[PDB]
Amino acid sequence: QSYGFRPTYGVGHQPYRVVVLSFELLHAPATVCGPKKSTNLVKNKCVNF
C-alpha cells in the first residue's frame, strides 16, 4: 500500500527518516578503530596496555 504524505497531516503521520548503525564488538581481528596514535613496545616491566 501507500505512504501518502501531505503537510496537512499532523505529528506522527509526517514521514520520519531513520538510519540504524549495527556494531560488531566481539573478540575478532580489528577492522575499524578510532583516531588514536600508537606508541612503542616495552617488555619485562609492570605496564598498562
Partner 1 sequence: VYADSFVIRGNEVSQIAPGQTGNIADYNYKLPDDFTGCVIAWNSNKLDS
Partner 2 sequence: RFASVYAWNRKRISNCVADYSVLYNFAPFFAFKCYGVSPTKLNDLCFTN
Site string for partner 1, 9-38 (x = CB under 8 A): --xxxxxxxxxxxxxxx------x------
Question: Is there a contact between 15 and 7 (Cβ–Cβ < 8 Å)?
Answer: no
The interface partner of residue 30, options being partner 2, partner 1, none and the CB cut-off 5 to 8 Å by kind, is none
Handedness of CA 26, 28, 31, 35 (dihedral sign): positive
Contact residues for partner 2, defined by CB under 8 A = 9-13
Closest CB to partner 2 among residues 11, 32? 11
CA atoms within 13 A on the CB side of 22: 0
- Positions that interact with partner 1 (CB under 8 A): 3, 5-7, 11-25, 32
